[PDB]
């Protein structure tokens, strides 16, 4: 009907007017007198070897010592970052893996990819080996991300413009999230594990609600696909990294845009976004083989994590904020400090 | 300066490394082919000659081929195409009998243009398959070809085919200096497609070896 042509437009106009009225000044004006962080130096403390193909994802454990990585060679290695040992090496059924996760309790890991199936593995077994515990199916597109809520629940985002919450024992979809008009590429979980956000190719991000399962807010402003997202440690803001060489920081309460992190010399897209423990540093992985760190309150490039020979595809920061680990397509993991 | 448990963990890690190296060495000796098409274009015939990703394994002359079909993905093609950046060859299947149906020839040409000029497939050679020879001949000897290509100016015969069709398909490849394109007619009962695939793979492997040697 024609109603989509006038009520939708007037509601969008009302939203824009409300956002503009609620905007008095910028974050830069508030943090104009803040002392700059200054130049930051980071060195390659460790280097993990053993992968024979491009690395697509990684995740830190809750003890800040163990991490899991996934690559195209059909392997899922669990490293010991303190001594560069290999605790486990799980052979995947399908080598087209593009995501991985680590359970908060350290008992299970998850992986998925082009097979549209999320697999859950058990690490503490009486037989001494690692065997798949559950295979979740129901998505009609490639699965791009998966995060563990607890030992019993997990959320996933696939290319079929939907996000779903699973129940591991039964294997049925407890809730389904709809509303995106493009491929969903990444998601992040709030610190209280009650809300989460998703970044889709629609050049927009949405804030969902795990409890009842409906979209709460929608954030626009980007100009291309969104490849990464991450929650601020406070839990009232998040950062997105798109393909137009721009990182942006939104705020849930203000429902507006706070800053944009762009430079004239950057033309390549962002593949990963992460924060520091106190939220003063924002780390991003670019396609130009580098990894820039940004003053989250001043939008000033404070350092460069150079030293990779291919595209940086993943990024992670430990829970205690003691190290940064990067993985690139040259099959090498480096733990900076 | 390590303890007994640390030494045992190091030994286990070394064993894991050995297993990983052996698996990688075993896997590096196989040939990977990516299969593309415009849908119901004869891919079923090709796969019978020898949800998501569908893999096929077949052996010829003591060589292990792997064939990937991506027909099950309705999502955007520019978000996962970079996964197959190391495939040795690309197999493209086109149905010659779709020239006067709803137009599909133009869609196949557009898909070929998109695939052949991607920033990722700058080196990988592409093998072109044209199917349905007999039915296409039966159709052309009755229906004119000018309906689908207005610019065509020639007689209506089979000999006119394999011209203004395969040459025009090869004309979409405006990167002739790096990668080659092989075209081969085929039908339901030929039993020789595997030989052509093997020849193309051998040529690609020879070129890759010469490039790696630095010569």
């Amino acid at each position: 009907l024609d109603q989509l042509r006038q009520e939708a437009e007037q509601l969008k106009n009302q939203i824009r007017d409300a956002r503009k009225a609620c905007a008095d000044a910028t974050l830069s004006q508030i943090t104009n007198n803040i002392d700059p962080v200054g130049r930051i130096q980071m060195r390659t403390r460790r280097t993990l070897r053993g992968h024979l193909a491009k690395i697509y994802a990684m995740h830190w454990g809750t003890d800040s010592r163990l991490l899991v990585s996934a690559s195209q060679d059909g392997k899922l290695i669990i490293w010991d970052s303190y001594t560069t040992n290999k605790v486990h090496a799980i052979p995947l059924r399908s080598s087209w893996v593009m995501t991985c996760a680590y359970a908060p309790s350290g008992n299970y890991v998850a992986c998925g990819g082009l097979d549209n199936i999320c697999s859950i593995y058990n690490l503490k077994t009486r037989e001494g080996n690692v065997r798949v515990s559950r295979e979740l199916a129901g998505h009609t597109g490639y699965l791009s991300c998966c995060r563990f809520l607890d030992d019993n629940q997990i959320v996933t985002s696939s290319g079929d413009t939907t996000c779903a919450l699973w129940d591991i024992e039964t294997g049925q979809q407890t809730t389904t999230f709809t509303g995106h008009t493009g491929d969903v590429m990444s998601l992040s979980l709030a610190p209280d594990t009650r809300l989460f956000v998703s970044g889709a190719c629609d050049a927009s991000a949405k804030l969902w609600d795990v409890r009842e399962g409906m979209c709460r807010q929608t954030f626009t402003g980007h100009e291309s696909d969104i490849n990464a997202i991450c929650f601020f440690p406070n839990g009232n803001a998040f950062a997105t990294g798109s393909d137009d060489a721009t990182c942006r920081l939104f705020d849930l309460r203000a429902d507006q845009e706070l800053m944009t992190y762009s430079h004239d010399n950057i033309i390549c897209g962002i593949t990963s976004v992460s924060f520091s423990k106190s939220g003063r540093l924002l780390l991003a992985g670019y396609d130009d083989f580098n990894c820039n760190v940004w003053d989250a309150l001043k939008a000033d490039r404070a350092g460069v994590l150079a030293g990779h020979d291919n595209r940086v595809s993943c990024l992670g920061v430990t829970d205690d904020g003691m190290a940064v680990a990067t993985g690139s397509w040259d099959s090498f993991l480096k733990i900076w400090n | 300066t390590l303890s007994a448990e640390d030494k045992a963990a190091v030994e286990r890690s070394k064993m894991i490394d050995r297993n990983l190296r052996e698996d990688g060495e075993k896997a590096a000796r196989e040939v990977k082919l990516l299969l593309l098409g415009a849908g119901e274009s004869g891919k079923s015939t090709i796969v019978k000659q020898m949800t998501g990703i569908v893999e096929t394994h077949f052996t010829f002359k003591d060589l292990h081929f792997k064939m990937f079909d991506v027909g099950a993905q309705r999502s955007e093609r520019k978000k996962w195409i970079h996964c197959f950046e190391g495939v040795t060859a690309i197999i493209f299947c086109v149905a010659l009998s779709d020239y006067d149906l709803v137009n599909r020839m133009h869609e196949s040409m557009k898909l070929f243009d998109s695939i052949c000029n991607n920033k990722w497939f700058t080196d990988t050679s592409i093998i072109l398959f044209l199917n349905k020879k007999d039915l296409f001949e039966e159709k052309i000897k009755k229906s004119p070809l000018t309906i689908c290509y207005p610019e065509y100016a020639g007689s209506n015969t089979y000999e006119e085919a394999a011209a203004y069709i395969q040459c025009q398909f090869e004309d979409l490849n405006k990167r002739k200096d790096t990668k080659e394109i092989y075209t081969h007619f085929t039908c339901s009962t030929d039993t020789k497609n595997v030989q052509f695939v093997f020849d193309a793979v051998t040529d690609v492997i020879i070129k890759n070896n010469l490039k790696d040697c630095g010569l």
Partner: single-chain antibody
Amino acid sequence: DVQLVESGGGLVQPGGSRKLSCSASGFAFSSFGMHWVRQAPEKGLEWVAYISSGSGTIYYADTVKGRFTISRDDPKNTLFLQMTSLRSEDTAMYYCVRSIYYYGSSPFDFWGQGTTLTVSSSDIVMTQATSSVPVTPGESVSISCRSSKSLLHSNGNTYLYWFLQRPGQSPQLLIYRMSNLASGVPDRFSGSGSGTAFTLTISRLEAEDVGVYYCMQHLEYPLTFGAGTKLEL
């Protein structure tokens, strides 16, 4: 389920030889290191030998070095201990203990059933001076084990283990690395202390747990057990 069974005992004349076999079924035998623990009639436990995963590392007790030989058969899941020039001091029941080593693992997890043998006719020292503690159920008891050398390594780990052996049963693992609790063990037990002095605490005492308790180290590969303390009544 997981179980280990071994056999090959009997009566052997002095100076002879006998071959022992351990049959393992129910777990990945290729990824586990296998020990060999003996037990004299009434003189506690004693380490004998060890073989790593892949047979890349073998150690022997100094008492039986040279005379004894230990080997494993991964394809058929069998552990072998070939021994020659047997002496009258080797009459003891032997056990079959598995152990897997990695970050956060639990070595000495499952103990075999045990086989008996009869014969016709450095070196860290621990003290378990206290031997008999008769306590009625419902109370709390404490056990003390002391090491000659401190068991606290540079990396922060304390390689001390606790074992319990109910009467007429194989020993069972209770605590590893002096603070962690083994899987399947009730939370009543709790081990703590410092270097060179360790203790084990039982909060609420009940029935099926009366037996002999042992302490063990894992720093340098000559392994030593305690004298063994037991609970009466």
